[PDB]
């Protein structure tokens, strides 16, 4: 079923984006005075922070490219999670039809 493949595909893709985002953030932030997003372990925690849109404020980019990377993370995360919500709807809508005969 498409909605399930998509969900899954969306999860593997998000994990890729997170990892690539941790890498790209450090590359972008290092070199900028006062920057804090400069070691991979925390950067990875930051990407998870961003994609889930929780945004604590303990870490965030300050360079143009860092922020640009941050926007791809947010958007991939929002889109990905929004797709799970959508696939859960197709499951419910499908099951609610069965329960009515159709």
């Amino acid at each position, epitope marked *: 079923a498409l909605h399930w493949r998509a969900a899954g595909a969306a999860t593997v893709l998000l994990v890729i984006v997170l990892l690539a985002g941790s890498y790209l953030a450090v590359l972008a932030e*290092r070199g900028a*005075p006062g920057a804090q997003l*400069i*070691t991979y372990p925390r950067a990875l925690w930051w990407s998870v922070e961003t994609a889930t849109t929780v945004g604590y404020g303990d870490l965030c980019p300050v360079t143009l490219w860092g922020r640009l990377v941050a926007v791809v993370v947010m958007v991939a995360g929002i889109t990905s999670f929004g797709l799970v919500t959508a696939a859960l709807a197709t499951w419910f809508v499908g099951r609610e039809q069965e329960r009515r005969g159709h």
Partner: antibody
Framework: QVQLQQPGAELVKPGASVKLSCKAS????????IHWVKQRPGHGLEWIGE????????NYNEKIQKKATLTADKSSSTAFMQLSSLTSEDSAVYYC???????????WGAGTTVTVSS | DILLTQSPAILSVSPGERVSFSCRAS??????IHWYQQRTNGSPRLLIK???ESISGIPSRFSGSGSGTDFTLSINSVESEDIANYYC?????????FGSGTKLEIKR
């Protein structure tokens, strides 16, 4: 085994330029950064800059005059520091170190003693 | 850019005694401080990372503690092999920076 190998010494004439090397062995990750640290006799450690080999980007210390230019050779696992127009101020021991992107210098090289004399 | 203050610059302690090295940051940096040892003629060698984490191949004698702006490197029961220069290094904010250093000194 010796993770970072550096030449023992380099002699340079005021104004001339030298190119120091740092050969790495052992585990190498795409998340590695090579650092260069300058130490004058009797004094402390001074960070010069860093290079991310797997990508090739370099950042430098903004407070001190920029006399360095970092490059790296992915194939031979060698990091290079290009010092130009050296003066007596630039004579010192230059160490290279490897950081795994977690902020601390895991291993340092024996360091190359540079001397700027005529 | 973060300034790491190391004072006193020299420390004199007697054989077997406990010694403590101080490192203060000009702003809060969590536990992003690392310690290096450097003997006469040798290159620096990581002693403690992240203010208090052990490194393999280093006498259980060495420990560290602190968080925020005040950090300590302690040697329980000093001994001649520990005579050297000690530096702290921070990785909280770019660029990484080093302390000016503290020399250890034994009184026999």
């Amino acid at each position: 085994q010796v993770q970072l190998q550096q030449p023992g010494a380099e002699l340079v004439k005021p104004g001339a330029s030298v190119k120091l090397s740092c050969k790495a062995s052992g585990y190498t990750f795409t998340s590695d950064w090579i650092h260069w640290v300058k130490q004058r006799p009797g004094h402390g450690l001074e960070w010069i800059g860093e290079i991310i080999p797997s990508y090739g980007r370099a950042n430098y210390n903004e407070k001190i005059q920029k006399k360095a230019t970092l490059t790296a050779d992915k194939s031979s696992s060698t990091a290079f520091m290009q010092l130009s127009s050296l003066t007596s101020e630039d004579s010192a021991v230059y160490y290279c170190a490897r950081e795994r992107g977690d902020g601390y210098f895991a291993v340092w090289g024996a360091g190359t003693t540079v001397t700027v004399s005529s | 850019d973060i300034l790491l203050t190391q004072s006193p610059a020299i420390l004199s302690v007697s054989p077997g005694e406990r010694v403590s090295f101080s490192c203060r940051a000009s702003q809060s940096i969590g536990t992003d401080i690392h310690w290096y040892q450097q003997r006469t003629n040798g290159s620096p060698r990581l002693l403690i990372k992240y203010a208090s984490e052990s490194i393999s191949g280093i006498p259980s004698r060495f420990s560290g503690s602190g968080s925020g702006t005040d950090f300590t490197l302690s040697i329980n029961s000093v001994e001649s092999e520990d005579i050297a220069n000690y530096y702290c290094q921070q990785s909280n904010r770019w660029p990484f920076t080093f302390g000016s250093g503290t020399k250890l000194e034994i009184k026999r």
